[PDB]
Design a protein around this ligand. Structure first.
Ligand SMILES: N#Cc1ccc(-c2cccc3ncnn23)cc1
Ligand SMILES: [Fe+3]
Length: 226
């Protein structure tokens, strides 16, 4: 067993099997995590992270879609490889899900505008995305001061998952009805990278209609090998 294999079998698999939610702290370590943050901010400064209106209407996310091989996206690429490796090692142990592919990385800036995101389900209408992964980059973050707490309400288990958006934290959860969630108002700028993994059969059905998500949120790219 390699380090990502050990993490999957001893931790991620039983977490996803039972709670459908998994949190991994110090996922990349301080050094590479630092390098990922550096690149995201460099993307932000280059004007590479790009609509307001769709009770709450006004958004504010500045996003870019990163494949991983672009100039100054190497560390982001390395993050994706590490997340991929972890998902690879879960194959056949998460149930019926065949995960062949995923979205590109959604590198995102979430400014402290004092607004949260209302209770939502990532994939309400069978668009093919089965697993959401969010990698957070916020150092010195205190929720009681800066807000921005994620709360997931899993349908299987009578609990609240209160997830602080902490630097070098990987969050993994089912994208469908099982995990409705809301992000509380925040009062400082945040960065996070999100990938969604596709279920082969569900995304095939979705494409057979056209119930796939719009834009890059519905564009498939293969999962990395070792
Ligand atoms: N850091 C940070 C940070 C803030 C907000 C969101 C965000 C926005 C919109 C929908 C949604 N669902 C789950 N997280 N999330 C993700 C990461
Ligand atoms: Fe969400």
């Amino acid at each position: 067993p390699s380090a990502p294999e050990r993490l999957a079998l001893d931790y991620i698999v039983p977490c996803m099997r039972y709670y459908g939610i998994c949190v991994v702290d110090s996922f990349l370590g301080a050094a590479l995590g630092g390098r990922v943050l550096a690149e995201v901010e460099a993307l932000k400064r280059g004007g590479r992270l790009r609509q307001l209106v769709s009770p709450r209407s006004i958004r504010g996310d500045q996003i870019a879609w990163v494949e991983g091989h672009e100039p100054g996206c190497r560390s982001i690429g390395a993050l994706m490889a590490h997340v991929d490796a972890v998902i690879r090692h879960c194959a056949g142990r998460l149930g019926s899900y065949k995960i062949n592919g995923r979205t590109k990385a959604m590198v995102a800036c979430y400014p402290g505008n004092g607004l949260g995101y209302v209770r939502h389900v990532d994939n309400p209408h069978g668009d093919g995305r089965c697993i959401t992964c969010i990698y957070y980059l916020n150092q010195n973050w205190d929720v009681k001061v800066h807000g921005g707490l994620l709360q997931i309400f899993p349908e299987g288990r009578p609990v609240v998952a209160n997830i602080e958006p902490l630097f070098d934290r990987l969050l993994i959860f089912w994208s469908d009805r099982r995990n409705p969630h809301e992000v509380k108002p925040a009062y400082a700028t945040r960065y996070a990278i999100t990938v969604w993994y596709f279920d082969a059969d569900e995304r095939a059905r979705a494409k057979d209609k056209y119930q796939l998500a719009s834009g890059q949120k519905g564009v498939q790219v293969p999962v990395s090998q070792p």
